[PDB]
Design a protein around this ligand. Sequence first.
Ligand SMILES: C[C@@]1(C(=O)O)CCN(C(=O)Cc2c[nH]c3nccc(Cl)c23)C1
Length: 167
Amino acid sequence: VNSFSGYLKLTDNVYIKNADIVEEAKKVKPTVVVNAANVYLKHGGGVAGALNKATNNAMQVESDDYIATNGPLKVGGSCVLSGHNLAKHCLHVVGPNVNKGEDIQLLKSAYENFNQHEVLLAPLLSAGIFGADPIHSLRVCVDTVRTNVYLAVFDKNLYDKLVSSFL
Ligand SMILES: C[C@@]1(C(=O)O)CCN(C(=O)Cc2c[nH]c3nccc(Cl)c23)C1
């Protein structure tokens, strides 16, 4: 038993809710919140900009030190950093950005990072400003992630469509 509430169950291990991931994180304090990161951990907009804003820019400060030490992530890769006031940990995961021409097949590799964590609160990778089809992203999530994932979908209209079209 865990503290996530109001989710619809899609599969044995995947759940989905119309929710702002920032507010969901603030209420649940999950062990892991996933950020829709880029390779530079520049949290300017989309989910990353919102999460970072909610940490009063502490996520960005920590991220800049991470990059200065380690260099950029790989597309499809991830790193574990602090969750600040939102979660114990933040798993920064880089899905491919279609608006940069990145290979959508890397989306499966991106979701594989979730399997290193037993339970996660997450957005749909490569959705929103990353330019992928959220329905495809949901399919890859379901077919790749084996751990328990709670997907927060900010837009009520997209949420309804994702549910209604789910196979
Ligand atoms: C539309 C979403 C939802 O409704 O759940 C799915 C994808 N998403 C993002 O925020 C993805 C994202 C990461 N960096 C960004 N920078 C600027 C704008 C966006 Cl969209 C993003 C929210």
